[PDB]
């Protein structure tokens, strides 16, 4: 198994989106960046904010597309292509409507599952990258999906998601060191408090 060398977090730009569920992927990556002291800088060339540094003895790049969510591939695709990073060395963190807050899963391969950021990336790099699916809950009806993902979660749900994000954070070491099956067991085993 490939070491993970590029971690992407999906979301929308601007302070009006910063706290919305749709930016779960940004939360995980911003928090990872600061855990390891990796600086995220504007990288207009690749339509995003990005950084690079040592995480647990491996050199990792971190990317947040600034394209808006549905256009995320306009940053992820040229960036991974420019640094010749294979999909199998990519982890993409993203909000997951199909799992509750406090649930988190590592998945390798498969399609976008309706996620409009992943929809914009699978076509161009293929599906064989890893995903950190951060459960955000489903509001109970298709009509309310949009106001849900584009909405700020209440405190209780936010704690659960943060709890799940902290757990995955503690597993990145396995991920960057190539132990994906171990990481998968250990991330996927998470249940809150």
Q: How many domains does the chain have?
A: 1
Q: Does an H or E element contain 175, and which?
A: helix 172-176
DSSP structure class, residue 44 = G
Tokens standing for residue 144: 């309310």
CA 178 to chain centre: 18
SS3 state at 108: strand
Of 22, 94, 130, 148, the catalytic one is 22
**83 is an annotated ligand-binding site residue:** no
Q: Is 167 a catalytic residue?
A: no
Instruction: List, as one string, the DSSP characters of 21-72.
Output: GGGHHHHHHHHHHHHTTPPPEEEGGGTEEEEEEEETTEEEEEEEE-S-GGGT
Q: Which domain holds residue 141?
A: 1-193
Are the CB atoms for 62 and 76 separated by under 8 Å? no
Residue 141 pairs with which residues in a beta bridge?
none
CA–CA separation, 24 vs 6, rounded Å?
Answer: 17
CA–CA separation, 30 vs 47, rounded Å?
Answer: 17
**68 is an annotated ligand-binding site residue:** yes
Measured CA distances, 76 to 26, 113, 138, 152 (Å): 14, 18, 26, 25
Q: Crossing angle of helices 24-35/155-169, nearest 10°? A: 50
Residue 45, burial from CB neighbour count under 10 angstroms (0-12, 13-18, 19+) = exposed
Residue 62 pairs with which residues in a beta bridge?
7, 51
CATH number at residue 42: 3.40.50.1470
Are the CB atoms for 36 and 118 separated by under 8 Å? no
DSSP structure class, residue 191 = -
Tokens standing for residue 130: 């890893």
């Amino acid at each position: 198994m490939s070491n993970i060398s590029l971690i992407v977090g999906l979301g929308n730009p601007g302070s009006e989106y910063a706290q919305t569920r749709h930016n779960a992927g940004f939360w995980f990556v911003e928090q990872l960046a600061d855990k390891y002291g990796i600086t995220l800088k504007n990288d207009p060339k690749f339509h995003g904010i990005s950084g690079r540094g040592n995480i647990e003895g491996h050199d990792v790049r971190l990317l947040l597309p600034m394209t808006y969510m549905n256009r995320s591939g306009q940053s992820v695709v040229p960036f991974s292509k420019f640094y010749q990073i294979a999909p199998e060395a990519i982890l993409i963190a993203h909000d997951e409507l199909d799992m509750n807050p406090g649930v988190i899963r590592l998945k390798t391969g498969g399609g976008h599952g309706g996620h409009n950021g992943l929809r914009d990336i699978v076509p161009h790099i293929g599906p064989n990258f890893h995903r950190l699916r951060i459960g955000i809950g489903h509001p109970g009806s298709k009509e309310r999906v949009s106001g849900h993902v584009l909405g700020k979660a209440p405190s209780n749900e936010q704690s659960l998601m943060d709890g799940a994000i902290d757990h995955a954070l503690s597993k990145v070491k396995l991920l960057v060191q190539g132990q994906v099956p171990q990481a998968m067991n250990q991330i996927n085993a998470y249940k809150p408090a």
